[PDB]
Design a binder for this molecule. Structure first.
Ligand code: G2P
Ligand code: MG
Ligand code: ZN
Ligand code: ZN
Ligand code: ZN
Lengths: 84, 178, 112, 171, 107, 271, 97, 557
DNA sequence: AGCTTTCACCTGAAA
DNA sequence: TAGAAAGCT
């Protein structure tokens, strides 16, 4: 249906899977000659540029966390805590 | 990839009945009196008269030029050359349909001004006809209520010959004298 | 509820017979799984594979064709929610990495 | 006639365009595809309205390639002809068979037989003409036609019309 | 509730569903000798009100089916006089959490 | 069979455990919501020993001249004596520690103290000791309120389930129940001050670590527990064979079980 | 080499969703069919050169989709079809739950 | 490599199972399938406009398809049909067909029980499409008379007249492929004593089924849209296309048609016998003979491994392989071709352990590294490196095997005349060699663990073995007594991340299975660790210095 | 009704 | 290779 940002209930922390998937996504996109959102401080591997992008929370990606019933919670990589 | 609509209907396996379209106001499945705007709300079908239409496109194309030069920061025979300029600026040009449509609308337009077209819209939307009839009464000029009820056969019982003949008189008064 | 306890007691008793240790949760889940349907639903061709999970998922174990013939007869609708049906269809399963969707936010994409 | 329909196209962007001039490209790609388009379903899609307020929505990144799919919600001006519709148009061509009339983006053709008998063809005229005991239909003349039937055809919707019935013909 | 010694004939038992909304139950004296509820492995089962249930379902975004199920015939479902659709909140002590709340809808 | 029977079960974004149907198998994964990887067998000190030894370890009586904390333990020791207000906070403490004990003895009935639990608290305090160079001579800068209250506060933050409502919030309590028992057992006032000899910074750092360490320990929605558990029971059953009263046991009893065999080989009651 | 049923299982246990798809499709089987949006079958005459796509016996020349499935599943589908079973494939849903 | 298609690309969200309506079979069919003659237009090598391509799929390879112009790869087959002379039971539904008859009146087509009966309205209540039919059947099997009037839902004196038809109901049993009943009879109230023993024709059951009310059949398993009961009986048989039954055309002027191509021919043959048999001078017994033969051929085509013994064997003694058998598990479609697959980008060799290897690495032989390829996108980052691998060739280690343009056409660096003179271009793919520190999936079947498959770091080495670290032995259950292991290479920057971020050896160190670490110090290292750490053990400075240097992270202290 | 009658079996590697 | 769920006299 789309749960509102206030009514959100999921882990405020990023799942091991989300992290693996965002890094994998950015890497694949960076590789496909996409715009890099951070200062490549001499970086040339997309997966390291991806982690760099993720460490500065400068990844424009949004995790749609679907729930059993079907409803979902949208979270930003900019707001998901990375204790991983 | 092609365009879709607000009408969601699921014809699972059960293909057809593709009942023909006529001026028995039996328009498409898509062209329903009871349609839905993409804000989720139900909305009546939007039918235009050759001027109500001309003014719509011209306006949208004009505001496109506005936005395009904003994002760039970092007399009938006379209106045809005028519109030709706007299209060369806003439209892809390859869209030869819109060029033809704009020339047709410019030459066959019944009402020159947004005040006139506005006023036409009042007069006609009083009737309680089906947007198609309402647009057709506006875009086609008739004299006898018979001239009308023959070309718009959908009317036939919908309005008093006299009342329709009253509207037709009023519409004739509005016609902007090119 | 007591049946469940006995079921695990007896399960655990086999794991600990060889001496080996398996963390509670695991056996607890298999026990709970067998238990939930209301009675003792077996880990057999006619116990779990008899439930209402997708036809394509169930057909990937024991009654392969027989299932698919009944699928046609009762005009079953496959959810395409199960791992197996996705493996069959060659789609990314809704497992770990696939349990959520990724999107671009033009808003933030402009902020940076 | 001439409708204002609410429509939606699913456009897929390559990750190379995941820059800030994104919505800008997406909106221009919509107008690439949709504008000028002709479907049998919605007819001619001539002009996309309210360019400034086109609904982008979040684009879902496609599983094995970086591309992201956007269902771009929009609104446009459409012209979809119908049988029984009366249309005002200008002649284009003229033959022994009839004359083709230009009505907006599409062409309605009228058979020698979908015309009153008295209106006969005249080959020996520059350009060809249809002569009646009163008026003459030729290449530039204006006509009010009754659409008899339509054929949904790739990039067009051609149609056949009558000028034999009452209150129809040249004007 | 009708506590019978040895048996109730199938002649008599046809009178059991005769008087609704009132409900009739039959218990064999021999079963009752010992309380099953008192047993080590049988935990605290609790009946849920229509309101309690509506909420449980709402809170976990569930369809009645999606709930773990208790049989109508369950020694405990009988004890508590459960009816089709009624929910039990089952409280066991866990070696992992300390206390764990389960739920069983009736069949 | 075990895998095909479990495959489709995983932790959904509500800490629930469900199949293809979305039918609830477990309400919270492994009745505690923790990932097995982040669990170590910890000792529940509270459970065993004489009610005498329990009293000795956990009891603080600021009103009795012998049962107060000697001002060798903390600076406050002198001024702490006889305080009725503070002594209600310690009576509160010791009355919960007793409650905890009676509950633990309800759960683990044989008095078994070693249980697999998240966050190694023994290690955290050990690591705090070398991290801060704890002086087993000088007195602590802690208050009785610094301890009793701080631990109470840490507990409210040990989140497994998030939702705002009774059903969910009451379930949150239930999940963290046993850990808290351990937390309180290992962070009582007498214990912190006499045994651990922690400073305020030390104790504040111990709390911030249990907090983080705990939050790390919770299962990740998406975790494929169907297969995980099926393989976890499955793999050992293979090394039972594939390598080198008298009841039916091993692979045959297991086979007997899974099949839910009616006519079993060695049936017996233990009266 | 074989990435057998057992190999699939560890891949599931792991959560490696995409990697599992990659082995099953790109690193193996993978095929592209054209399906009808009415009767979810491979009936579609795909003249992908003249951009014509038809499913006579639906007379559908519009509601056609392109789908990526293992050639084994394409096979399995045709096989079940040959045995009078319709395994209709739909790109949308209706049940919800 | 399949071509660009306009059609919007989507995924399957629902699989709607059902039955083919003979009307559908006809509609969708691109041909019938008139002749048993395979091909050879009167010995002329080329398909016959009768069986396998009377518009169908396509053999030849160097011949585009007759319907879609695609041909071979890109062209799935196009279904055919065969109008059967007499209706025949579908071998699977044979039981449901019977169970349906057992529930309805064999004359009017109305349920043997209804809402007037108590148990029936209770069984009809059941929401489950199978459990409903289950209870409905067990109730209606015993009702041997279609009732005209039934006692009212109030009193036994005034009996309510439901549907008509009084007719006695036959007692059905199967004689294998034949459904035969025994009508109770009446004669002076008693009799049987000797009943009426007629065999039920496919065509009769068919007609009774057609008359079963939508409401009636929907109360049974059925569905008015996808699965009507009448569709269990085969009238129009769908002819599968070549992809299903390939012509393995060996050498040139020699066939090699599939079992199914012969079985369909057998069916075609059996049909024309029956067709002319009944059109011509019908010697009636010879028809019920040519009929039973068609019912068998159509039966064994789908399932050859039936209970009623005749194995229907190919003239070689060997049985004909049914469609059913193809799908049947542990090998065959579902289990062996779909749940499990043979895969590209995979390698297997004999394993031997290395002590001077890091835990997370895998020794990969130079040969295997020179064989295995990763697709890299020419990005300004690698644009330089890549051209050098491309220049290096596919024969010498850090090198590449192919360059794939935007133009989606493979450059075989191995043979290509432009192998040197090949300037790259962003957006191209260089299929390079597997190099040091690329993630790979290492495996040892068994495969009973999450841990029996872990992601390692490539470290290319000489000699033909996979060199794994000894402490990572225990989680695979590996030893070096002749053991081999599999290696799979990811292909996307996405799938690499999957391996690196989830399945890597260091991540797997602590087992969730037993909440204990699944790897440790083993053998030599375990033996020598005791031996080294005794109170008695002392090391001279000369060696201490060597031991120190040997530790890679030693402070220098 | 009770005995009869009826209906899957480890993973990869091989010739 | 041996164990349950259909249906048999
Ligand atoms: N899944 C299977 N694993 C098998 C099979 N045959 C052998 N093995 C594997 O072989 C390994 C045992 O090998 P051996 O019998 O050659 C052992 P060995 O006598 O040299 O050893 P010790 O254990 O060191 O005393 C063990 O890891 C099993 O997983 C089989 O049929 N299936
Ligand atoms: Mg070995
Ligand atoms: Zn179709
Ligand atoms: Zn073809
Ligand atoms: Zn009857």
């Amino acid at each position: 249906k789309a749960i509102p940002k206030d009514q959100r209930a999921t882990t405020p922390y990023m799942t091991k899977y989300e992290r693996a998937r965002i890094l994998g996504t950015r890497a694949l996109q960076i590789s496909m000659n996409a715009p890099v959102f951070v200062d490549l401080e001499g970086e040339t591997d997309p997966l390291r540029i991806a982690m760099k992008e993720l460490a500065e929370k400068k990844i424009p990606l949004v995790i749609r966390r679907y729930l059993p019933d079907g409803s979902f919670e949208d979270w930003s990589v900019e707001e998901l805590i990375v204790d991983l | 990839v092609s365009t879709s609509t607000f009408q969601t209907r699921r014809r699972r396996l059960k293909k057809v009945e593709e009942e023909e379209n006529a001026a028995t106001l039996q328009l498409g499945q898509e062209f329903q009196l009871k349609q839905i705007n993409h804000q989720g709300e139900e909305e009546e079908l939007i039918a235009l008269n050759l001027s109500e239409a001309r003014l719509v496109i011209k306006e949208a194309l004009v505001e496109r030029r506005r936005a395009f030069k904003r994002s760039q920061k970092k007399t009938r025979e006379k209106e045809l050359e005028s519109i030709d300029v706007l299209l060369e600026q806003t439209t892809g040009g390859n869209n030869k349909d819109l060029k033809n449509t704009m020339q047709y609308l410019t030459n066959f337009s019944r009402f020159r001004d947004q005040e006139t077209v506005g006023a036409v819209i009042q007069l006609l939307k009083s009737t309680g006809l089906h947007p198609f009839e309402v647009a057709q009464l506006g875009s086609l000029a008739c004299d006898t209520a018979d001239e009308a009820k023959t070309l718009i056969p959908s009317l036939n019982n919908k309005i008093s010959d006299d009342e329709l003949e009253r509207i037709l008189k009023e519409l004739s008064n509005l016609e902007t004298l090119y | 509820e007591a049946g469940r306890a006995a079921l695990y007691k007896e399960v655990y008793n086999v794991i600990a017979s060889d001496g080996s240790y398996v963390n509670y949760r695991h056996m607890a889940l298999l026990v709970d799984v067998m238990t939930t349907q209301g009675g003792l639903t077996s880990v057999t061709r006619h116990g779990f594979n008899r439930s209402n999970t997708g036809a394509l998922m169930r057909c990937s174990f024991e009654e392969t064709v027989e299932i698919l013939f009944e699928a046609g007869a009762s005009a079953e609708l496959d959810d395409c929610r199960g791992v197996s049906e996705n493996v069959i269809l060659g789609q990314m399963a809704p497992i770990g990495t696939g349990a959520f969707d990724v999107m671009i936010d033009e808003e933030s994409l402009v902020k940076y | 006639m001439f409708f204002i329909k609410d429509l939606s196209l699913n456009i897929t962007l390559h990750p190379s365009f995941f820059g800030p001039r994104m919505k800008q490209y997406l909106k221009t790609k919509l107008l690439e595809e949709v504008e000028g388009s002709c479907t049998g379903k919605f007819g001619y899609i001539l002009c996309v309205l309210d360019y400034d307020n086109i609904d982008i929505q979040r684009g879902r990144i496609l599983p094995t390639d970086g591309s992201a799919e956007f269902n771009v919600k929009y609104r446009a001006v459409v012209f979809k002809p119908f049988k029984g519709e009366v249309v005002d148009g200008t002649v284009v061509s003229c033959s022994q068979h009839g004359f083709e009339v230009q009505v907006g983006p599409m062409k309605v053709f009228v058979t020698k037989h979908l015309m009153p008998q008295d209106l006969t063809f005249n080959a020996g005229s520059n350009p060809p003409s249809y002569q009646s005991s009163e008026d003459v239909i030729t290449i530039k003349s204006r006509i009010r036609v009754k659409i008899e039937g339509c054929i949904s055809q790739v990039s067009s919707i051609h149609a056949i019309g009558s000028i034999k019935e009452d209150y129809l013909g040249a004007i | 509730i009708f506590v019978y010694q040895n048996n109730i004939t199938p002649s008599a038992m046809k009178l059991v569903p005769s008087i609704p909304p009132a409900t009739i139950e039959t218990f064999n004296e021999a079963a009752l000798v010992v309380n099953i509820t008192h047993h080590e492995l049988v935990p605290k089962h609790i009946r849920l009100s229509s309101d309690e249930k509506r909420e449980l379902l709402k809170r976990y975004r569930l369809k009645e089916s999606q709930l773990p199920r208790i049989q109508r015939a369950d020694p405990v479902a009988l004890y508590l006089g459960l009816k089709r659709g009624e929910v039990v909140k089952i409280i066991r002590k866990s070696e992992t959490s300390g206390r764990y709340a389960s739920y069983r809808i009736c069949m | 069979r075990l895998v095909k029977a479990l495959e489709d079960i995983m932790v959904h974004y509500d800490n629930t455990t469900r199949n293809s149907l979305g039918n609830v198998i477990q309400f919270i994964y492994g009745e505690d919501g923790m990932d097995a990887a982040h669990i170590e067998k910890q000792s529940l000190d509270t459970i065993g020993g004489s009610d005498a030894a329990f009293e000795k370890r956990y009891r603080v009586d600021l009103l009795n001249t012998d049962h107060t904390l000697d001002p060798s333990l903390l600076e406050s020791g002198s001024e702490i004596l006889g305080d009725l207000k503070l002594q209600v906070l310690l009576d509160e403490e010791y009355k919960q520690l007793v409650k905890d004990r009676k509950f633990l003895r309800e759960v683990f009935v044989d008095g078994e103290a070693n249980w697999p639990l998240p966050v190694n608290i023994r290690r955290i305090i050990q690591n705090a000791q070398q991290t801060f160079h704890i002086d087993h001579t000088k007195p602590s800068d802690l208050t009785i309120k610094d301890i009793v209250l701080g631990v109470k506060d840490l507990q409210e933050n040990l989140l497994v389930l998030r939702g705002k409502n009774e059903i969910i919030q009451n379930a949150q309590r239930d999940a963290v129940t046993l850990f808290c028992c351990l937390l309180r057992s290992r962070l009582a006032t007498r214990r912190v001050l006499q045994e651990y000899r922690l400073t305020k910074q030390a104790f504040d750092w111990v709390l911030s670590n249990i907090e983080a360490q705990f939050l790390r320990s919770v299962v990740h929605p998406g975790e494929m527990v169907g297969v995980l558990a099926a393989q976890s029971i499955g793999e050992p059953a293979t090394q039972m064979t594939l390598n080198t009263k008298k009841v039916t046991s091993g692979v045959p009893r297991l086979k007997e079980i899974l099949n839910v065999a009616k006519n079993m080989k060695t049936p017996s009651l233990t009266v | 080499l074989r990435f057998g049923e057992m190999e699939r299982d560890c891949m599931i246990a792991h959560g490696a969703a995409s990697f599992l798809k990659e082995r099953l499709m790109e690193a193996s089987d993978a095929f592209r069919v054209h399906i009808c949006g009415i009767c979810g079958l491979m009936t579609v005459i795909a003249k992908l050169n003249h951009n014509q796509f038809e499913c006579k016996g639906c007379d559908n020349k519009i509601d056609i989709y392109q789908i990526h499935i293992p050639y084994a599943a394409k096979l399995l589908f045709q096989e079940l079809m040959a045995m009078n079973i319709t395994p209709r494939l739909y790109t949308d849903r209706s049940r919800d739950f | 490599g399949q071509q660009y298609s306009s059609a919007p690309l989507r995924t399957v969200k629902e699989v709607q199972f059902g039955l083919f309506s003979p009307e559908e079979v006809r509609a969708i069919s691109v041909a019938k399938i008139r002749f048993p003659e395979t091909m050879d237009e009167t010995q002329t090598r080329a398909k016959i406009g009768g069986l396998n391509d009377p518009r169908l799929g396509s053999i030849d390879r160097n011949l585009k398809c007759q319907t879609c112009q695609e041909g071979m790869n890109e062209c799935p087959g196009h279904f055919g049909h065969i109008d059967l002379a007499k209706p025949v039971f579908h071998v699977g539904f044979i039981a449901k067909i019977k169970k349906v008859c057992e529930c309805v009146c064999m004359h009017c087509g109305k349920l043997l029980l209804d809402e007037h009966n108590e148990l029936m309205r209770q069984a009809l209540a059941i929401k489950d499409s199978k459990k409903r039919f289950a209870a409905i059947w067990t109730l209606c099997k015993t009702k041997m008379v279609c009732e005209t009037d039934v006692p009212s839902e109030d009193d036994p004196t005034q009996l309510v007249s439901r549907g008509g038809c009084g007719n006695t109901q036959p007692t059905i049993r199967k004689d294998g492929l034949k459904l035969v009943g025994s009508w109770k009879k009446d004669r002076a109230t008693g009799d049987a004593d000797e009943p009426e023993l007629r065999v039920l024709s496919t065509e009769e059951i068919l007609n009774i089924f057609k008359h079963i009310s939508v409401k009636d059949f929907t109360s049974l398993g059925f569905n008015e849209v996808f699965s009507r009961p009448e569709w269990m009986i085969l009238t129009c048989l769908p002819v599968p296309p070549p992809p299903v039954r390939p012509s393995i055309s060996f050498n040139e002027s020699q066939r090699g048609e599939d079992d199914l191509t012969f079985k369909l021919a057998d069916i075609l043959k059996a049909n024309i016998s029956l067709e002319t048999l009944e059109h011509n001078g019908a010697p009636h017994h010879a028809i019920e003979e040519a009929e039973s033969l068609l019912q068998f051929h159509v039966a064994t085509y789908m399932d050859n491994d039936i209970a009623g013994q005749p194995q229907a064997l190919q003239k070689s003694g060997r049985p004909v392989k049914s469609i059913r058998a193809r799908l049947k598990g542990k090998e065959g479609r579902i289990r062996g071709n779909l749940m499990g697959k043979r895969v590209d980008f995979s390698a297997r060799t004999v394993i031997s352990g290395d002590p001077n290897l890091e835990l997370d690495q895998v020794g990969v032989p130079k040969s295997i590294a020179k064989t295995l390829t990763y697709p890299e996108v020419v990005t300004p980052y690698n644009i330089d490196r890549l051209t050098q691998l491309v220049r290096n060739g596919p024969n010498e280690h850090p090198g590449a095997k192919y360059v794939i343009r935007d133009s989606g056409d493979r450059i075989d660096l191995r043979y290509s005349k432009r192998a040197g003179d090949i300037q790259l271009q962003y957006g191209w793919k260089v299929e390079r060699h597997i190099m040091d520190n690329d993630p790979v999936l290492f495996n040892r079947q068994p495969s009973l663990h999450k841990m029996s498959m872990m992601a390692h770091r490539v470290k290319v080495i000489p000699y033909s073995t996979f060199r794994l670290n000894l402490s990572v032995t225990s989680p695979y259950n590996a030893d070096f007594d002749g053991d081999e292991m599999n290696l799979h290479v990811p292909q996307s920057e996405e799938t690499r991340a999957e391996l690196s971020q989830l399945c890597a050896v260091p991540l797997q160190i602590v087992s969730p299975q037993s909440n204990k670490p699944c790897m440790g110090i083993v053998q030599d290292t375990l033996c020598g660790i005791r031996k080294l750490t005794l109170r008695d053990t002392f090391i001279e400075l000369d060696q201490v210095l060597n031991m120190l240097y040997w530790v890679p992270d030693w402070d220098g202290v």
